[model samples]
Target: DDFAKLEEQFDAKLGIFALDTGTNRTVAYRPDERFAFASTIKALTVGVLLQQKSIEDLNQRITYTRDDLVNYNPITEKHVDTGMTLKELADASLRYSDNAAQNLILKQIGGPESLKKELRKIGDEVTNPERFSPELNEVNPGETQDTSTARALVTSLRAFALEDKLPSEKRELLIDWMKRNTTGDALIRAGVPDGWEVADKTGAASYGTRNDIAIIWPPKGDPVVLAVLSSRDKKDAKYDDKLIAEATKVVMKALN
Candidate 1:
């Protein structure tokens, strides 16, 4: 089977899900498995924060110190002392996957617990966000790291596509930021045909975890939502990207 081949070639536990929003058609492979959230959690953080405050309020400033900084951040490195606006923070969170920006937003909303409560209100039960991004490596002696399943991701992506739960303007801002997301080129976007539009977030960690969730607008049909996640004992970043691209090609072929 194609999945078997993907599994062997990818060298990881892979989860993939795609849904055609217009017709409600769907596809998946191991969609239920838990995968690390990585920086992708920034999307949820931004979504929940936008619900609490309008984008008009996004210009309101939030102060931070060096204590709040984390690695893999480009936005904060320059402005470490001066700080940035809420809007700039959120943009950096999604557009560049900035860890510092992500934590600042997550902290502003009262942490993972509050975000989980917001998600539950929307009936998204499959995403389990337990810690801040910097704490991802420090699981308790017996605890698990933060995680999300493909189905849960697609569910959230569906909500983003619907734009009913949130103010239309805010949803557009979020999706637009995603469309301009400067990261995750090797995953979902890697496989998309030229001229198609894809808005997505990518998550990656040191121990062979690579995940991407996307809302794709095909040139000739209704939009689709796709999430692909991978976890493995050995790190193979290149292979992980290839796995998502391959699955995307397959799904697009069968659906189109």
Candidate 2:
């Protein structure tokens, strides 16, 4: 079900890249271009959250609000739970693609202004400059809007995984949170054999685009990092599936 019947759909263009820890080298296919980030932005959001919350304690109280519930389903979306921990938001963002968790994190991180500053500091500057677009529905206006790039995505994941390289212990917490990610339904997980552990996220946006970023561990082998981005016929979901499948296989083969 990773692709949701990809064979039946044939309108996809795939982008794939693999990084090998053993060789400290990487191989890529059309990996230099840009693509929309989608929910994958949540990864950065978590990083910022940890920085803002102070490194020692992630067990802070955070309540779900209406703005945070923008993309969530109706059921758990509206519940006002007290004492929300950073781990819970991190889990919900990664494990279930919970929109509410993302929005809440964004709010806590001082909205887009703060996020934009962090993004710029990381050297991934946004090109557009304007107040928050209603389309993005951000709490405040931000300098950069619309982000895409396999390099940025993979780099962030790498920074997260290699916590020792980060600026602080908070970075370690962010990495740990990301390592605990067990959700995400494609590319990274699809090509792996059973009993393998994968920590990653998936991204999908307008124009039939889907992206997968992962740090995967083989049951008996060392871990590897892989990224796959796809843009296919918007009218056909199958094309997305096919592209994702092909990209998944490509990355898996390259890493193996």
The prediction achieving the highest TM-score against the true structure is 1
Pairs with backbone N, CA or C atoms under 3 Å apart (clashes), candidate 2: 132-141
Q: What CA RMSD would candidate 1 show? A: 2.3
Model 2's TM-score against the true structure: 0.77
The numbered model that scores best in lDDT is: 1
Report the C-alpha lDDT of model 1 over 104-145, residue by residue, as the tens digit. Answer: 898889888888888888788877787887666332222345
In the range 72-111, model 2's lDDT, one tens digit per residue, is 5333364565536666766677666676677666767777
- C-alpha lDDT values of all predictions: 0.80, 0.60
Clashes of 2: 1
Off by over 4 Å in 1: 137-145, 235-239
Q: What is the C-alpha local distance difference test score of candidate 2?
A: 0.60
